[PDB]
Design a binder for this molecule. Structure first.
Ligand SMILES: N#Cc1c(Cl)ncnc1Nc1ccc2c(c1)CC(=O)N2
Ligand SMILES: N#Cc1c(Cl)ncnc1Nc1ccc2c(c1)CC(=O)N2
Ligand SMILES: [Cl-]
Ligand SMILES: [Cl-]
Ligand SMILES: [Cl-]
Ligand SMILES: [Cl-]
Lengths: 4, 124, 124, 4
């Protein structure tokens, strides 16, 4: 999971 | 927005769509290319091809279970492109590049046409 | 094999699948969550959820146009997860995390359950 | 396009  | 994103999600969805295709699960159309038939999902075809997007948004053609392609279309070229649609992988070879490019032009798959033109220009 | 790969292909396919969903194009099921209804494509639901994969591979349920979820399922939780399925983006907030996690557990979406557990553990 |  990432900060898009 | 303040969303988080799962990097592999799109790839995992496509992998599962390909698994469904291989097991003939919820496939809703057969693409006929001369003597050959290819089962697929209309939504995936529309999502990858300007030609299929046009065909399946048509009020009559959207309901067809069989679509016959132009007799000049090469079945191997179509097979390579159908595999690309479901995997992101293009099996581009010296022996098939002309057929792949002509099929990609007909199917309106701009990025495939682009890499074919570039590979052809490098060999001249 | 000796294939080349188009990095953005999977993301572009998913973007187009979401555009089709927003325009209600070739959607083939309605998911009922108490008083709310959500139109979707069976293949995308199966590709994202262990529960939908089970439902639509069932010889009787595969043909249903309406699926009613358990009355304990929160419609907002379902909406956030349906958006995630079609975009890779999860709108996870303090006000919705418990509903999102419970819905992801029911839908069998392991990666969503995992990030919810981690965000909850960080706040305790 | 890349070599996967
Ligand atoms: N399904 C869908 C769809 C939608 Cl909803 N919006 C916009 N394009 C869509 N698909 C589509 C249209 C044109 C082309 C491609 C895909 C690849 C390409 O080279 N040309
Ligand atoms: N459609 C399809 C499908 C196929 Cl074909 N093969 C394998 N899994 C499939 N989908 C599916 C099954 C289990 C789970 C998910 C998706 C996400 C998750 O957390 N659990
Ligand atoms: Cl027909
Ligand atoms: Cl393309
Ligand atoms: Cl029904
Ligand atoms: Cl997930």
């Amino acid at each position: 999971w990432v900060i898009p | 927005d303040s969303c988080i994103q799962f990097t592999r999600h799109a790839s995992d969805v496509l992998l599962n769509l390909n698994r469904l295709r291989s097991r003939d699960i919820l496939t809703d159309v057969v693409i006929v290319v001369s003597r050959e038939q290819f089962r697929a999902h209309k939504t995936v075809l529309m999502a990858c091809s300007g030609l299929f997007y046009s065909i399946f948004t048509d009020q009559l053609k959207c309901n067809l279970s069989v679509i016959n392609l132009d007799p000049e279309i090469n079945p191997e070229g179509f097979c390579i492109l159908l595999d690309f649609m479901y995997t992101s992988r293009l099996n581009l070879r010296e022996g098939n590049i002309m057929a792949v490019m002509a099929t990609a032009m007909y199917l309106q798959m701009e990025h495939v046409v682009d890499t074919c033109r570039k590979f052809i220009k490098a060999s001249e």
